[PDB]
Amino acid sequence: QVQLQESGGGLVQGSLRVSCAASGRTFTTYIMAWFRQAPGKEREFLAAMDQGRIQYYGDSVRGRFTISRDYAKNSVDLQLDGLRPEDTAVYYCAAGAGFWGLRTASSYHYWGQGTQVTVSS
Amino acid sequence: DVTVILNNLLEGYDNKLRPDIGVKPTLIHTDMYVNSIGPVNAINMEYTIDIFFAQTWYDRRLKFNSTIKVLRLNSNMVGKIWIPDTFFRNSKKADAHWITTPNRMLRIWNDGRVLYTLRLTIDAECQLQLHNFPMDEHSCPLEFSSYGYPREEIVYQWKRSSVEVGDTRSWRLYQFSFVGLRNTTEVVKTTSGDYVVMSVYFDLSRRMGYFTIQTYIPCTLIVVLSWVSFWINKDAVPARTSLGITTVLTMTTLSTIARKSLPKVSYVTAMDLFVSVCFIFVFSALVEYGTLHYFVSNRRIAKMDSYARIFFPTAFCLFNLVYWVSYLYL
Amino acid sequence: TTVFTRILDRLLDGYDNRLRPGLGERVTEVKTDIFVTSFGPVSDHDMEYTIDVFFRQSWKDERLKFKGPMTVLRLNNLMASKIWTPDTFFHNGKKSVAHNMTMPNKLLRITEDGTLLYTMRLTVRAECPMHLEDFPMDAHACPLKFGSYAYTRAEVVYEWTREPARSVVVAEDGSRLNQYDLLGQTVDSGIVQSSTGEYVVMTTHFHLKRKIGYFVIQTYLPCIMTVILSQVSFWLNRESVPARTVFGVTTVLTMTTLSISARNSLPKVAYATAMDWFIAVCYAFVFSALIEFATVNYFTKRGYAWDGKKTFNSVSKIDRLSRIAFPLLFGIFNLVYWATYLNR
Amino acid sequence: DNTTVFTRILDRLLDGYDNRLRPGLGERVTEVKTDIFVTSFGPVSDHDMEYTIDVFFRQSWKDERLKFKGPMTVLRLNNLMASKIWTPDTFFHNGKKSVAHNMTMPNKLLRITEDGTLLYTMRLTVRAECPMHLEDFPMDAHACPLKFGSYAYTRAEVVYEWTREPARSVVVAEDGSRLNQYDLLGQTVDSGIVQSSTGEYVVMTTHFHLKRKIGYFVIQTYLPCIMTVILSQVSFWLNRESVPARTVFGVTTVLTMTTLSISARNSLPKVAYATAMDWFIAVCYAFVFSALIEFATVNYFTKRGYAWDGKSKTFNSVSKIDRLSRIAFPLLFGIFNLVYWATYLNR
Amino acid sequence: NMSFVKETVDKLLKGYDIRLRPDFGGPPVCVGMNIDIASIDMVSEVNMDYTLTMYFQQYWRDKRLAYSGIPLNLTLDNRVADQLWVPDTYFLNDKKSFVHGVTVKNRMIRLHPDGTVLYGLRITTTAACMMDLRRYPLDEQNCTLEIESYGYTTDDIEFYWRGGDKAVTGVERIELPQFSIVEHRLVSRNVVFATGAYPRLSLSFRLKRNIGYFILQTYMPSILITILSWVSFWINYDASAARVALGITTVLTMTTINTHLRETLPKIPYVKAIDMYLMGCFVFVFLALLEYAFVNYIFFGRGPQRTDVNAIDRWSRIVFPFTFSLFNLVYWLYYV
Amino acid sequence: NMSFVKETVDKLLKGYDIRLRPDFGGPPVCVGMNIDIASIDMVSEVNMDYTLTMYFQQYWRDKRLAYSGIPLNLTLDNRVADQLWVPDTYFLNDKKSFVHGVTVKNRMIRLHPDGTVLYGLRITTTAACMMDLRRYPLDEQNCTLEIESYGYTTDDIEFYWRGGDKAVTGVERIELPQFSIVEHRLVSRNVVFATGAYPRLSLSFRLKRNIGYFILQTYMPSILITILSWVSFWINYDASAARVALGITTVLTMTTINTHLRETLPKIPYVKAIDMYLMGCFVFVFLALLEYAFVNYIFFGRGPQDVNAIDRWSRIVFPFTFSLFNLVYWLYYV
Ligand SMILES: *[C@@H]1O[C@H](CO)[C@@H](O[C@@H]2O[C@H](CO)[C@@H](O[C@@H]3O[C@H](CO[C@H]4O[C@H](CO)[C@@H](O)[C@H](O[C@H]5O[C@H](CO)[C@@H](O)[C@H](O)[C@@H]5O)[C@@H]4O)[C@@H](O)[C@H](O[C@H]4O[C@H](CO)[C@@H](O)[C@H](O)[C@@H]4O)[C@@H]3O)[C@H](O)[C@H]2NC(C)=O)[C@H](O)[C@H]1NC(C)=O
Ligand SMILES: CCCCCCCC(=O)OC[C@H](COP(=O)(O)O[C@@H]1[C@H](O)[C@H](O)[C@@H](OP(=O)(O)O)[C@H](OP(=O)(O)O)[C@H]1O)OC(=O)CCCCCCC
Ligand SMILES: *[C@@H]1O[C@H](CO)[C@@H](O[C@@H]2O[C@H](CO)[C@@H](O)[C@H](O)[C@H]2NC(C)=O)[C@H](O)[C@H]1NC(C)=O
Ligand SMILES: C=C(C)[C@@H]1[C@H]2OC(=O)[C@@H]1[C@]1(O)C[C@H]3O[C@]34C(=O)O[C@H]2[C@]14C
């Protein structure tokens, strides 16, 4: 059974580092992404790193978040920096080959659980 | 001394201009030493050849008055002297050799005669007419002429020993045997002009030890193996049928080799005619028992086992009488 | 450094790379040396072999003398292409490669007396004339033949450097042979009298012998166990007419499958190899086992076998003698085969 | 007069021009706007995990040193001067062996406008590296990337863009499909950043979305393997006293599945796992294997040798292990086709 | 003689600029193409291309390269083409092409005294052509060769077939072992790209695939194997070890044909017309073996329970030749 | 400035001799290397080689290229590498290689103000490694990449891996189709040839072959064909047409497995671990048909002068011996 167990923090004023340790399948070939869902049911693309270490970013979080996969440990990270209360949402760790993908949730067939990042100014 | 000679020849020399450009055609005496004829490809209809290709022509701009009498040089002088644009007319992948140096040579005598020899591998083209396979002869050509200079400007001519052949048994001729050699001189007419075209023909017969024991000897023994059922009892139906349909399955298996080293030609070769008729005699042996089982048991004809013991070995030996005479002695 | 630049710039003054050293003086002596790093794969389908060498060659050039604080100066690319190098080519080479990664893999070292040292890393795809009549119990002598192209015996003369046998040396891990065994090399000097002059030729014969153990378990042992299995049907009762036919036709079909797969893993030579004389005779002992049954079935006279306790059949004396003669004449044939072709 | 002015403009552009250094080497970044016209999305090699693409690869950037004033507003250049003008070092991050065509002349054009804007196009054949996940073979779909960027110039030196909206930039020709195994469903254009050991580079990215057509594998692999399993179940309706016949019928269906397992195996690169066609062949090889073990159980409980003559001593009966296997084995193969063709036509 | 030719050729190259077209300020130069085809080498259905070796000639007039006093056509060495203006023509279908280089690079420059210039090239090109192989092996294919100028638009350069009926020669002498060239056409038109318009010429063949290979290797064995599966209807129904063994070997012989033709024929992974015939003949063999199990189940299975064994075999002697005859009737008229 | 940068670079290459090593009479130059592997493309057992695409990078200090005033690292064009001294490093394993030349030749020169120079190359090499395929397909493979200076000895040039063990990157991103990289290692040593003593760097992998491909194709049907040869033990001895047609078609199916795997597996002509299993399974298929003719000769040939006992004996021994043969096989090669 494939487990995308997420970790990291859950409350900050400040930087944060949300991680995602995978299990059951080597995802080196696959694209390991990060999404965002506020209350309102909108899966928003944040970051995705390909197998050739290519960092894609959504234009709302470009220059702020830093994705960094570790291929020996089969994990994807996300260095949250310059956080605002608009970034208070559930961060999903996705993994899968992007068919009609890299910006679309229907291309990611493996999913994380969820990590409530709460920012209160 | 020779530096003084070589720099006096190249001073004022124009390599763009043919020697005697407005006077007379430049006569070139070609020569060829065939190292090896490589594998004659039948699917691509190619053959590989490796030659030392020599050329002599008079260039009166390269006369020198000295006591050296010959200037034996490297390939460093080839790019400065006028060199004829001899191309091979039916080549597909022709290459010169470049290890360890450019393998060329250039000798200039004091009368203005220039020897130019270079080593070449030519992947030439010959349309193999694969009728009578594998009992056919071929004469694959190797044509060459100048590319831009017409008959009025460059004329080619063979020497005394025109095409010279080496040891003839270190060659890469798998399925062929070198049986002859022939040269000719012709003039083709293309759009740009008339060109003097040299041509060398290599006569190639077939060695036949492969196709006899892989196809011919197995396919004869299986038609004989289908005749085994005629001396087996009529009322033993699983044994007659097993000699029927498994003998067919082995004929279908040996139709693989019949078009193995061949292109997809759409005529019946001599190999394809033999495998087809050996398939028909194997086909007709099971149809013989299938009609004999119905016309006797399941309801003359009842003595058709007695007739098939005579008729099928006769018709197969009369086939090999017509086959092996028409494809060897006709 | 300017003194090192001034020696290199004032060395190519009046030098002409179109002229041999000692042109009107002497015969240029070139001492060649070969270090085989790896003796690569031998292609039966192309009659060739690959070899990766450090091709060394050394000669004296009095025009390149110098005086300075050094004794040997090392030159990578540019000055080595403005100096006379011998036009050494391989007589049986087909398409060989000088390696160009990351720079051209050449070195020209000039000593202070004029003795040059010019090495290169080549991958020579030379032609080995192989006669495969004894396949696979055969040996081959694959030659390297190299000499000059333009200069005859009166102009340049090749020799080996230290010793003939000690010159061509292979590496300790440069085997790279899947199905051959390099049984030592043998060198020799020679002279080819071509139609342009007489040329000095350095020869080097690599002695190769094909491994047998692959073709035994892929071709020989399945063909022996199929000839045996067609002869296993002689110890059956004569009344099992469907059972003894299925031994007959399918071992032909098994030998047909084994005859195709044993020939396509071999270059398409048009003569009978030593494996092809084994399979075709093994195809005949299988064929003769069912021609034997056609004679047994002709003299049967009744279509019922023996009970557990009316008359019955005999043990059919043609089958009694074929139990002895066919394992003997196939056992004699393997003693003739494996003593003829394991003799050469 | 026009042949005199035009040669003197091309002489004064390269006076003081150093092509070794970037336009604005210490001043600003070089925005190189790129553009791709795909003329043939060539044949994709499954056994090499690569594909081929023919592009007209366009580039546009501003160089201040190449300003001019003359009769015409745009110049055209021979490629001897295009090799003397600075050119961005675009390479393909997944290119294997790509070809810059030069028949009959080098297929490149460089166009200078009067304000300094350069337009530089070339005709290329790019053999790129497409990673494939063949766990669902042949009912799978994968996105083949075409990723390019600068080789030596980082984000602080050369930034790539697109000449328009990114979905409108990469254009595929309408007759330029040139695929026979796959089906080009459409492209996706994006842009990314690498973190190399040397520095951070801007990477333009185009993903081509391919779905394999499975009509060839149904006729060549699936339907003969289905009909061979249907054969080995049809021997259950034969009588139990056909001891040679149901033996001959049983093993020949195994050799037929052995023949079909070989030819289906050759049309696949050697992955380290079970493809979706390999889950089908190995289960279909089990229904044929288990159909002969059924007859080995029927033959163990036959007790007679003769069968029912048509005119009628005691006889045999049609066995319970035959009447169960007439129901069980066509059902378990029919349920398996419902599970197989709904799992893999959903993914 | 020699020095008077030498001074004029040095005068034609004196002050020459290779960056200018003929009549650079005014009218477009009219480049006339002329193709002599040596051979067509390998028409590949897998890679969807063909290899074309041809003599490629271009004629245009350049007023700078005009000379007087010489009544000859100056065939210069091919190295002067690196010092002249030659057109930038490319092939759009080109996957891989090269100019031959034995014994020299096979070009020619033939200057004429009225400025006319011949520029020949001996080119082996691999040109991409899309193939529709749904009617394999009974199909026809046009494969083209798109000749186009790369940089110059139709106001700077113009292309024309020189003698537009007979501008391309050597087509009727091509011997393809697998195809048959029906006709060739010459088209002169103008295309439009994003950078600008361009002139374009196109030679276009029409290959017709010959069928004598496929009748002898694919069809006529597959017919005779299906006829052998009909032998088990004139065999008595008690012969269980004969009607089964003839039927299950015949589905194996059809299988060894299909797995062999998957190997030797080019791998074209979609549904062709030879796939609809080999799978079609596989069914008539598959149904002839289901016929005996329908006979064996009625006589023995539903026999003691007490629908005629002779009547089902007599029905399959009539229908299975006739339905297979209707199979060849629908096949050989839809695809022909 | 931009016009000042041209005057800075033009006096670096004025009087610069590319034929001379840096410190040509002094100390040896220390070249530090760095490899970023893009992909290992294919690992071929027939040709005994592997294809390697990498970003090969070298750093060395050159005093003749020290520039002052400019506070930035001069990243020049790739064509200035033809006007500098670059090392003459090569690869001994190299069968065939090329620097990528689309859209330009993929080189780089990144000068530093102290004289440090980076020279990167995107190289697709086909490095040769020999394989011990006697345990195929249950084997581990060690394939290397030897990096050596061609002309310059260890008194002229000196190599080191820049970064230590973190020099070669990108190995963890490699997902080979039928292999699995266990561990890569970095070796620095000096090698003496007939001309001199040269410095050598070695990158070397450890490939472990995945086994799931060969179980479904080669092992599992070859097992199930041997089990179908055992079906001729639970059938009566009077069934002559049945017990032969099992074992005869069973030795034909073992032939069509072995001959068609010879056309499918890579051709390496010596005895592998998969050849001894397929020849080992062919004997149990061959002996199971010898079991019937030993039964058929006793009841009918030596009959009028036990039969159920031999069929009962072979139901136990041949499943036991084949399971014993798997216990010898799957412990010796695992
Ligand atoms: C294999 O497949 C290829 C690709 O499909 C086939 O190639 C095609 O061949 C046909 C001929 O069979 C070509 O059509 C011809 O095109 C020429 C060129 O026309 C151009 O130049 C004209 C001036 O010289 C100009 O008038 C044309 O403009 C008009 O036409 C276009 C449409 O074509 C229209 O949009 C414009 O508004 C104009 O009306 C154009 O710029 C043309 O001269 C030919 O016309 C002749 O034939 C037509 C009838 O077909 C007739 O009406 C005319 O009076 C005249 O007699 C003709 O249109 C076509 O261009 C080729 N396709 C491509 C992509 O180039 C090939 O034939 C196939 N092989 C084989 C062997 O069949
Ligand atoms: C490839 C071999 C080709 C052999 C071709 C041989 C062709 C040939 O002519 O064979 C004749 C005969 C075969 O007969 P075979 O022994 O098989 O059959 C018995 C024989 O016919 C007796 O005469 C019969 O008895 P009878 O009539 O009631 O008195 C007996 O009847 P029954 O008891 O069943 O009721 C038969 O079973 O063989 C020899 O004599 C020895 C030859 C040894 C040859 C050994 C060769 C290895
Ligand atoms: C190549 O052609 C030349 C010219 O025809 C041949 O030379 C002549 O050969 C004939 C005999 O065949 C002699 O009678 C003539 O005297 C030869 N003439 C000259 C000028 O030598 C030559 O034999 C041909 N070579 C081959 C191998 O056929
Ligand atoms: C080994 C094969 C090809 C098959 C097997 O079953 C078949 O149907 C094929 C057949 O050729 C035909 C029939 O004689 C057969 C037999 O008894 O089993 C075998 C025999 C020989």
Question: If DSSP codes are grouped into helix, strand and coil, which group holds residue B11?
Answer: coil
Do the Cβ atoms of F177 and D96 come within 8 Å? no
Q: Same structural domain for residues B152 and B246?
A: no
Distance CA E109, CA E112 (A): 10
The range of the structural domain enclosing residue B43 comes to 1-207
Task: Look up residue D190 and give its two tokens.
Answer: 């994006």
Q: Which of B153, B173, B138 is nearest to B38 (CA)?
A: B173
Length of chain C: 344
Specify the 3-state DSSP secondary structure of E28: coil
Which ligand ends up closest to the CA of C297?
A: 2
Kindly determine whether residue A97 and residue D193, on different chains, have CB atoms separated by under 8 Å. no
Q: Give the integer Cα–Cα distance in Å for B325 and B316.
A: 14
Alpha-carbon distance values, E62 to D260, D322, E30, E86 (Å): 67, 92, 10, 10
Which residues have C-beta within 8 Å of that of residue B27, sequence separation ≥ 6? B57, B58, B155, B157
Q: Evaluate whether E301 touches E258 at the Cβ level (below 8 Å).
A: no
CA distance D141 to chain A (A): 7
> Which amino acid type is present at position E94?
D
CA dist B295 and B312 (Å) reads: 20
* C156 contact partners, CB below 8 Å, separation of at least 6: C20, C27, C28, C29, C30, C86, C148, C200
By the 8 A CB rule, do F60 and F22 touch? yes
Reference B253, options E259, E276, E275, D225; nearest CA is E259
Distance (Å, rounded) from C-alpha F287 to C-alpha F289? Answer: 5
Residues of D in contact with A97 (CB under 8 A): 133, 142-143
Smallest CA–CA distance from E99 into chain B, residue? B93
Q: Is F121 on the interface with C (CB under 8 A)?
A: yes
The CA C293 to ligand 4 mean position distance, Å, reads: 17
Q: Does D147 touch chain A (CB under 8 A)?
A: yes
Looking at the fold, whether B190 and B237 belong to one and the same domain comes out as no
Nearest Cα to C41, choosing from C144, C124, C121? C124
Give the D window 78-97 contacts with A, CB below 8 Å. Answer: 93-94
Question: Quick one: how far is CA D182 from the chain centroid?
Answer: 7
Cβ within 8 Å of residue C154, ≥6 positions away: C27, C197, C198
Same domain, B275 and B194: no
- For residues D249 and D310, the answer to whether their CB atoms sit within 8 Å is no
Residue that terminates a domain, selected from B188, B207, B226: B207
The one-letter amino acid at C94: K
On whether both B187 and B223 belong to a single domain, the answer is: no
- The H or E element spanning position D55 is strand D50-62
**Six-digit token pair at B282?**
């194997």
Contact B76 C17 (CB under 8 A): yes
Q: How many domains does chain B have?
A: 2
Residue owning the nearest CA to atom 11 of ligand 2:
C318
CA–centroid distance, residue E187 to ligand 1 (Å): 7
Q: Is D39 in Cβ contact with E293 (below 8 Å)?
A: no
Instruction: Say if ligand 4 is within 6 A of residue F240 CB.
Output: no
**F256 Cβ closer than 6 Å to some ligand 4 atom:** no
Name the residue among E313, C235, D170, A74 with its Cα closest to residue F293: C235
Select the residue of C98, C150, C263 nearest B105 (Cβ to Cβ).
C150
Chains A and E touch (3+ CB pairs under 8 A): no
Side-chain-facing half-sphere of C159: CA atoms under 13 Å: 8
Query: Whose CA is closest to C145, among C177, C86, C190?
Result: C190
Of A54, A98, A99, the CB nearest to D147: A54
CB atoms within 10 A of CB F166: 11
For the purposes of burial, counting CB atoms within 10 Å of the CB of A120, is it exposed (0-12), middle (13-18) or buried (19 or more)?
A: exposed
Which of B207, B229, B257 is at the close of a domain?
Answer: B207
List the single residue in D with minimal CA-CA distance to E20.
D3
Q: How many Cβ atoms are within 10 Å of D48's Cβ, its own excluded?
A: 14
b (16+ CB within 10 A) / e for C73-94: bbbbbebbeebbbbbbbbbbbb
First to last CA, chain D: 70
- Residue positions forming the annotated binding site of E: 88-90, 148-150, 193, 195
Q: Do A28 and F172 touch (CB under 8 A)?
A: yes
Nearest residue (by CA) to ligand 1, atom 19, is: E189
E strand or H helix at D273: none
E223: its two tokens: 């017919």
Shortest CA distance from F37: residue in chain A: A52
Contact status, residue A46 vs residue A115, Cβ threshold 8 Å: no
F59 is annotated as contributing to ligand binding: no
Give the residue carrying structure tokens 């002992």: C285
Nearest to F90 among C1, C40, C102 (CB): C102
- CB pairs below 8 Å between D and F: how many? 191
Tell how strand D117-129 and strand D99-100 pair up. Answer: antiparallel
CA of C293 to the centre of ligand 2 (A): 12
Distance B179 CA to ligand 3 centre (A): 18
- Taking residue B101's Cβ as centre, other Cβ atoms within 10 Å add up to 18
Domain shared by B100 and B139, yes or no: yes
Q: Are F229 and D296 in contact (CB under 8 A)?
A: no
Closest by CA to D306, choosing from D243, D245, D246, D241, is D241
Dump the DSSP string for E130-182: ----TTTTS-EE--EEEEEESS--TTTEEEEETTTTSSEESSTT---SSEEE-
Residue A79, min C-alpha distance to chain F (Å): 21
Q: Which ligand is nearest to the CA of B181?
A: 3
Sign of CA dihedral C76, C77, C83, C89: positive
| Residue B129 burial (CB count, 10 A) | 14
Considering B207, B227, B256, which residue would you say is the last residue of a domain?
A: B207
Q: Is residue A35 a contact partner of residue A43, using CB atoms and an 8 Å limit?
A: yes
Cα B120 from chain centroid (whole Å)? 18
List B residues 22-81 in contact with E (Cβ-Cβ < 8 A).
22-23, 44-45, 53, 61
Whether C153 has a binding-site annotation, put simply, is: no
What is the distance in angstroms between the Cα of B47 and the nearest Cα belonging to chain E? 13
Helix (H), strand (E) at residue F318: helix F308-332
Q: What is the DSSP string of D212-248?
A: ---HHHIIIIIHHHHHHHHHHHHGGGS-TT-HHHHHH
- Ligand 4 centre and the CA of F79: distance in Å? 72
Note whether B198 and B221 are same-domain residues. Answer: no
Does any ligand 4 atom lie closer than 6 A to the CB of residue D252? Answer: yes
Peptide bond into D269 cis (omega under 30): no
The answer to whether the Cα torsion of B206, B207, B209, B210 is positive or negative is negative
With H, G, I as helix, E, B as strand and everything else as coil, classify residue F201. strand
> B118 CB near a chain C CB, below 8 Å?
no
Ligand nearest to the Cα of C244, by number = 4
Nearest Cα to Cα of residue E42 among E213, E211, E202, E174: E174
CA distance E211 to chain B (A): 6
Residue with CA at minimum distance from ligand 2 atom 2: C292
Q: What separation in angstroms does the CA of D213 have from each of B122, D223, D261, E266, E277?
A: 43, 16, 21, 17, 20
Cα–Cα dist B201/B126, whole Å: 10
| List of residues 6+ apart from E127 with CB closer than 8 A | E49, E50, E51, E52, E91, E93, E94, E95, E143, E144, E145
Helix (H/G/I), strand (E/B), else coil: D176: coil
- B-contacting chains (≥3 CB pairs under 8 Å): C, E
Which whole-number Å values give the CA distances from C110 to B1, C47, C64, F89, in the listed order?
25, 39, 8, 21
Upper half-sphere CA count for residue C248 (Cβ side, 13 Å) = 33
Closest CA to B53 of B97, B92, B111: B97
- CA atoms of C252 and F31, how far apart (whole Å): 67
Within 10 angstroms of residue F325's Cβ, the number of other Cβ atoms is: 16
CB B278 within 8 A of CB B221: no
The residues, ordered by sequence, that sit 6+ positions from B198 with a Cβ below 8 Å of its Cβ are B30, B143, B144, B145, B156, B158, B183, B184, B185
Q: What angle do CA B236, B238, B242 make, to 5 degrees?
A: 120
Query: Cα–Cα–Cα angle for B226, B230, B232, nearest 5°?
Result: 105
Give the residue, by CA position, lying nearest to ligand 2 atom 5: C295
Which ligand neighbours the alpha carbon of B32 most closely? 3
The verdict on E266 touching D (C-beta cutoff 8 Å) is no
Contacts of F175 in chain A (CB under 8 A): 26, 28-29, 51
Please name which of C59, C52, C22 lies closest in space to residue C159, comparing C-alpha atoms.
Answer: C59
Tokens of F287: 């002996």
Strands (E) located in chain A:
3-6, 11-12, 16-23, 31-38, 42-49, 54-57, 66-70, 75-80, 89-90, 93-96, 110-111, 116-119
Residue C301, exposed/middle/buried by CB under 10 A (0-12, 13-18, 19+)?
Answer: exposed
φ, ψ dihedrals at E72, nearest 5°: -105, 160
CA F165, CA F163: separation in Å to the nearest integer? Answer: 6
CA gap E331, E325 in Å, rounded: 10
Selection from C275, C289, C294, C301 nearest residue C329 by Cα: C289
Chain breaks in chain B (C to N over 2.5 A) after: 299
Which residues in chain F are closer than 8 Å to C236, comparing Cβ atoms? 240, 293, 296-297, 300
Same domain, B170 and B311: no
Instruction: Report how far residue F89's alpha carbon sits from residue F199's, in angstroms, rounded to the nearest whole number.
Output: 10
Residues of D with Cβ-Cβ distance to F100 under 8 angstroms: 91, 95, 98
Cα separation, C27 vs C152, whole angstroms: 10
With a Cβ cut-off of 6 Å, ligand 3 is lined by B 158, 160, 162-163, 181-183
Burial of residue E335 (number of CB atoms within 10 Å: 0-12, 13-18, 19+): middle
Pairing of strands C106-111, B154-165: unpaired
Interchain proximity D188–A101, CB inside 8 Å:
yes
Residues whose CB is less than 8 angstroms from the CB of residue D302 and which lie 6 or more positions away in sequence, other chains included: D240, D241, D243, D316
> Which of E204, E205, E206 maximizes ligand 1 atoms within 8 Å of its Cβ, making it the mutation to test the pocket?
E204
- Tell me the DSSP string of F227-243: HHGGGGGSS-TT-HHHH
- Using DSSP's 3-state secondary structure scheme, residue F31 falls into strand
Residue B257 contacts C where some CB pair is shorter than 8 Å: yes
